[PDB]
Amino acid sequence: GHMATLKVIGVGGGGNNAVNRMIDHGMNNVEFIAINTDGQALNLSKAESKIQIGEKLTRGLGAGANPEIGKKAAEESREQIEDAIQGADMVFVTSGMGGGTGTGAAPVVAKIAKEMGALTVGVVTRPFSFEGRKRQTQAAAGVEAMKAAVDTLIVIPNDRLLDIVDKSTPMMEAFKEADNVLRQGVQGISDLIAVSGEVNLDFADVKTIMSNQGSALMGIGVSSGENRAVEAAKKAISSPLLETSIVGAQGVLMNITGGESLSLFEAQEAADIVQDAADEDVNMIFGTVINPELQDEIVVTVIATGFD
Ligand SMILES: CC1=CC(C)=[N+]2C1=Cc1ccc(CCC(=O)OC[C@@H](Oc3ccc(F)c(C(N)=O)c3F)c3nc(-c4ccc(C(F)(F)F)cc4)c(Br)o3)n1[B-]2(F)F
Ligand SMILES: Nc1nc2c(ncn2[C@@H]2O[C@H](COP(=O)(O)OP(=O)(O)O)[C@@H](O)[C@H]2O)c(=O)[nH]1
Ligand SMILES: [Ca+2]
C-alpha cells in the first residue's frame, strides 16, 4: 500500500497558464507537470516537471491551431509522457480546447495516463464564442476525444465567464475564477485521502464514482449560521461555470465537514438537497468529517457522475 498520489498536468497554453496560477496560489502534496510544444512558454513554467513535446515536429514553436500537430507531438513524445506520469494514482489533465496543442495533445496525454493505470480526470475549457465557429468546432472535436480518453470530464465553456464578470472585471481575474474548479477539486480529493473521516471516504470511493463515467460535476459549498447545511449543499452543486449540471446525476460522492456542532438533521438536509436537485435516485456515497478547528462553518463537497 501507499497514500494515493495526485498529479496535475497542463497541456498547451491555457493548461500551462492554469498550472502556473495554481502554483502561485499554493498547492501541497500534488506534482505539477507542464506539457507544451511551445518551448518559450515551457521555459517560463513554474512546474517542477516540464515536457517539450513535438520537438522534431514544431522545433519549439506552438502548433499554430492545427490539432493534428498537437496529437502527433504527444505521440512523438509518448515515452517522455509515460515517464512523467509513472506512479500517479490520479491524474488531472487541464487544457484549453480550440488551439493546436491542447486540442490534439491533451486526449493523448489522458489516454496514456489511463493506460498507465491512473484515474484520469480532464478539466477543459471551450473557447469563447467571440473566437468564432471554426475554433468552437475544433474544440468540440477535442472535447469528444477527451471524453473517449478520460475516466471523467469537466467542461467549462469560456462563455460562462461572461456571466460572472461586470464590464470592468480584469480578464486575468476571470481566468482565476475558472481555475478554482480544478484547484479546489484537487484540494478536496487530497483532503479526502489524507484524513480518516468519522464516516470515511477514501480513494477507492473516488474510483467507484469517477471510473469510466464521462461527464462530471465537481463543486464545493461553504456556509455558516442559520441554514448553513442547505446553503452549503446548494453552493456545492450549482456552479455558473460548468457545462454539466447536477440534474440527472446517478452517482454522487458527497462529503460534509463541520465542527463538533455538525448535526445529524443538517447532514440529512444537505444530502436531501443533492438528492432532489439531481431529480434522480442517486447512488450516494456519503462521508462526514468533524474538524474541531471549524467553529460555525460547514463545507459540502460533491462529485456527481452517471449522466450518460
Ligand atoms: C479559502 C477556503 C475556505 C474554506 C471553507 N475552503 C477554502 C478553500 C478550499 C479548497 C477546497 C475546499 C473544500 C474541500 C472539501 O471539503 O473536500 C472534501 C473532500 O472530502 C473529504 C475531505 C476530508 C475527509 F476526511 C473526507 C472523509 N469522509 O474522509 C472527505 F470525504 C472531497 N473532495 C471531493 C472531490 C471529488 C471529486 C473531485 C474531482 F474534481 F476530481 F472530480 C474533486 C474533489 C469530494 Br466529493 O469530497 N476549500 B474550503 F474548505 F471550502
Ligand atoms: N479560461 C481560460 N481559457 C484559456 C486560457 N488560455 C487559453 N484559453 C482558451 O484556450 C484556447 C486554446 O488556447 P491555447 O491553450 O493557448 O492553445 P494551445 O497552446 O495551442 O493548446 C483558446 O482559444 C482560449 O479559448 C486561460 O488561461 N484561461
Ligand atoms: Ca478519508
Atom of ligand 1 minimally distant from the CA of 189: 33
* Domain limits for position 105: 6-187
Number of CB atoms found within 10 A of residue 153's CB: 25
The C-alpha atoms of residue 205 and residue 254 are separated, in whole angstroms, by: 10
Query: Got the DSSP string for the chain?
Result: -----EEEEEEHHHHHHHHHHHHHH---SEEEEEEES-HHHHHT---SEEEE--HHHHTTS--TT-HHHHHHHHHHTHHHHHHHHTT-SEEEEEEETTSSHHHHHHHHHHHHHHHTT-EEEEEEEEPPGGG-HHHHHHHHHHHHHHHHHSSEEEEEEGGGGGGS--TT--HHHHHHHHHHHHHHHHHHHHHHHHS--TB---HHHHHHHHTT-EE-EEEEEEEESTTHHHHHHHHHT--TT-SS-STT--EEEEEEEE-TT--HHHHHHHHHHHHHHHTS--EEEEEEEE-TT-SSEEEEEEEEE---
Spacing of C-alpha 116 from chain mean position? 19
How much distance in Å is there from the Cα of 300 to the middle of ligand 1? 7
96 lines ligand 2 (CB under 6 A): yes
Nearest CA to ligand 2 atom 14: 13
Using alpha carbons, select from 162, 103, 98 the residue that is nearest to residue 133: 98
Contact 34, 10 (CB under 8 A): yes
How much distance in Å is there from the Cα of 204 to the middle of ligand 3? 10
How much distance in Å is there from the Cα of 45 to the middle of ligand 2? 15
Number of CB atoms found within 10 A of residue 139's CB: 26
| CATH code of the domain in which 32 resides | 3.40.50.1440
Report the relative pairing of strands 251-258 and 297-305 from DSSP bridges.
antiparallel
The C-alpha atoms of residue 274 and residue 284 are separated, in whole angstroms, by: 9
17 lines ligand 1 (CB under 6 A): no
What resolution in angstroms, rounded to 1 decimal? Answer: 1.6
Burial class (CB in 10 A: 0-12, 13-18, 19+), 204: exposed
251 lines ligand 2 (CB under 6 A): no
Report the relative pairing of strands 251-258 and 283-290 from DSSP bridges.
parallel
Contact 284, 275 (CB under 8 A): yes
Spacing of C-alpha 258 from chain mean position? 24
Cell of residue 167, nine digits: 464590464
Q: Is 251 annotated to bind ligand?
A: no
Q: Is 101 annotated to bind ligand?
A: yes
**What are the beta bridge partners of residue 129?**
none
188 lines ligand 1 (CB under 6 A): yes
Nearest CA to ligand 1 atom 20: 192
